[PDB]
Amino acid sequence: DPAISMDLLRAVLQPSINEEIQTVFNKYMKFFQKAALNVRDNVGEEVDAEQLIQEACRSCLEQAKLLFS
Amino acid sequence: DPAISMDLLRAVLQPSINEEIQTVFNKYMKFFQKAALNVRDNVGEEVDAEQLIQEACRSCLEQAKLLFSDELPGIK
């Protein structure tokens, strides 16, 4: 299955690609942190700021898939 | 819902983040291109090499979501 061989290469490259993606996101993290703290500061204790930050980061990656449509 | 402020920020940052992601993937693209051509050469004409490359790139982004989930493949 052609998708499987591609996937084996993908797995090989993932650790390097992850490291560079982390370095990219580190530059933006402060913006997400501030915005998520803002939400918590306005709404209250029942807002999990860390979870808002993580969801927003995962969404960015989801939307970045449109680079490869 | 006030937490939609996260989405809006995200939409604002996306173009910049997308440019840097592209720059990252350009360094690895030659591996994916060679592998996809190898598959097409060894299976036949009905393999779309471009589509194999794209699907592998999207999978990379999917797996990169583990960086931001509650160990992780990395270079450190």
Author numbering:
A (entry chain B): 62 to 130
B (entry chain A): 62 to 131, 142 to 147
Cite, word for word, the article reporting this structure.
In conclusion, we have shown that DNTTIP1 is a dimeric protein required for the stable assembly of the cyclin A associated MiDAC complex. In addition to contributing to the assembly of this complex, DNTTIP1 also mediates a chromatin-binding activity that is likely to be important for substrate presentation to the active catalytic site of HDAC1.
Human DNTTIP1 (56–147) crystallized with six molecules within the asymmetric unit. Each monomer consists of a long amino-terminal helix divided into three by two distinct kinks. Carboxy-terminal to this long helix, the peptide chain folds back on itself leading into a second, shorter helix arranged at ∼60° to the central portion of the longer helix. The dimer is arranged such that the longer helices in the two monomers lie anti-parallel to each other and form a saddle into which the two shorter carboxy-terminal helices are packed together, also in an anti-parallel orientation. This arrangement results in a large buried surface between the two monomers of 4083 Å2. The core of the interface between the monomers consists entirely of non-polar amino acid side chains. The Dali protein structure comparison server identifies no structures that are significantly similar to the DNTTIP1 dimerization domain suggesting that this is a novel fold.
